[PDB]
């Protein structure tokens with residue numbers, strides 16, 4: 160199949176003249192263009208039967224020619240009316256435009272009305288989402304790199320905590336993000352969390368500049384962006400010997416996350432995936448301290464679909480990428496979460512991270 | 522000078538019953554509360570003649586109460602339809618809504634339309650924009666903090682390239698952002714730029730994993746967020762002895778940048794300010810290698826208004842803060858940008874960054 164013709168198909172299905180695709184992730188998804196226009200206008204225009212068009216800001220125009228996807232391309236100088244400029248590159252004649260209802264500002268939506276008239280708008284986002292839901296092999300390979308970087312992050316974070324010597328959570332975080340940015344990593348995919356001890360039991364918490372508690376556990380939630388794709392991974396380890404309680408809390412979570420992993424294959428339902436991790440934890444008595452969903456989808460964002468939640472009966476299919484991250488957070492005592500993100504394969508599933516799941520001691 | 526009141530003044534003058542303000546940055550500015558709901562729904566609600574409300578996600582209600590002004594907070598649970606929760610709270614009686622056209626996605630406006638009828642939307646973004654055009658005294662003081670942090674980044678960053686020993690562009694960057702993260706600056710104000718040699722001519726150039734080139738220039742463009750406001754400065758230096766053809770450039774750029782700082786005061790135009798600098802540079806032959814405006818507004822955002830471009834006949838006034846980044850970029854041979862942001866004093870102007878602009882050697 161073609162991604163752009165799938166959209167084009169949809170346009171003909173819905174009697175929609177063109178699209179004005181504005182979301183940055185979405186343009187990267189559809190064309191390979193990593194562009195942030197900020198205040199200034201950009202938009203991908205896919206037609207029913209007509210060459211697709213790429214409106215970018217003039218300074219951005221030719222490194223959109225680079226990354227060239229048979230797309231036409233044209234810009235505007237920070238002086239003309241973007242919308243006027245676009246009305247005249249479109250040679251007649253528009254009454255319906257599919258837009259990303261999620262993303263498109265009402266100014267952009269009003270610029271187009273000014274030049275094109277009383278137009279209908281149709282929400283492209285659901286199709287985009289449906290497309291993004293299943294990852295092609297290129298997409299999977301780029302995610303595995305992000306996952307590699309996460310595993311590299313765990314080594315760093317573990318090593319850096321073992322050294323103690325008054326080391327704080329903030330210290331861990333920075334040393335991790337430093338080695339990452341050092342290796343060309345453009346940014347993390349979410350705020351790195353190092354939570355020590357009872358503070359890990361607060362899912363609200365974030366790393367402060369506090370010392371690491373000895374003989375307690377330490378939570379590690381981190382992820383990289385690599386090539387516009389996301390990784391998300393958690394590990395909890397022991398700084399020093401654990402107490403026999405937090406050690407079993409880890410065991411329950413760990414088997415839980417491992418049992419869900421052994422379960423996942425095409426045919427199962429997210430609800431059932433959630434149920435496997437959930438049922439074995441509640442059985443152990445901790446169900447009341449596991450009050451987020453088992454997982455979220457991952458791709459170009461740390462959060463997309465499918466959602467692995469009790470209500471959701473979606474049948475898991477080959478190519479879906481989602482996390483699997485059970486937890487037990489006992490306010491004031493311990494918090495343990497073991498997060499892997501995986502991809503469903505023809506026969507089961509494979510993981511994007513590979514660090515040991517065991518309660519390692521440092 | 523009460524900001525809510527400024528907006529309620531707006532609503533009454535324009536006979537618009539309510540607002541629904543959605544920009545996360547706008548909500549800090551107006552309330553001092555730094556909330557960002559991501560895809561959750563938040564909205565500042567002002568009325569012609571009634572107490573203000575602030576609608577935030579449940580996860581957020583309890584520090585929109587501490588941490589903020591003291592106006593009427595309420596939230597929603599992911600169980601409820603956020604717009605429904607909004608209409609239930611607004612007794613009488615809406616036929617209109619001022620909203621930020623540069624921010625409110627078509628989804629949120631339609632969410633509002635559903636609970637409210639066919640309502641007239643009115644663009645509050647302009648007023649916001651000019652409210653933010655004129656910085657108060659302590660606004661300027663926060664930005665000094667941001668400026669002082671950039672000066673530090675420049676020092677720390679200078680040393681790291683001097684230590685040669687195969688240190689790359691990305692060596693400097695993460696080293697810089699690491700020292701900011703430890704001084705309490707988790708967030709840079711935009712993507713730190715350390716570019717060596719001819720890569721400096723490239724506008725879209727981003728620090729890669731490439732050795733610091735000996736005997737060429739090294740451009741540092743860095744800035745920081747602290748306490749809600751941002752800084753932006755550029756400095757370019759020499760790595761060892763430069764070829765003083767490259768160094769004649771720095772002498773030009775440096776004197777242009779300086780020309781405009783001495784020239785700026787209340788009364789002259791943003792064009793008159795771009796002219797001063799853009800024609801100390803045409804008058805040195807490199808007229809068509811000045812690829813951009815002389816500077817941008819700055820404040821809570823690093824790119825706000827006013828635009829320092831030739832096309833704008835705006836009269837500068839006291840309280841305006843904006844960039845001053847004249848630069849020469851000769852493809853494949855050199856690029857030199859030297860930038861400062863400044864506030865406009867009673868008669869004259871002061872900079873937020875004082876790091877030496879002269880061409881240093883390391």
Ligand SMILES: [Mn+2]
Pocket residue numbers: 391392455482484498
């Ligand atoms: Mn996750």
Ligand SMILES: [Mn+2]
Pocket residue numbers: 380381391392393498
């Ligand atoms: Mn995570």
Ligand SMILES: [Mn+2]
Pocket residue numbers: 742743744753754755846860
């Ligand atoms: Mn800059």
Ligand SMILES: [Mn+2]
Pocket residue numbers: 753754817844846860
């Ligand atoms: Mn700038």
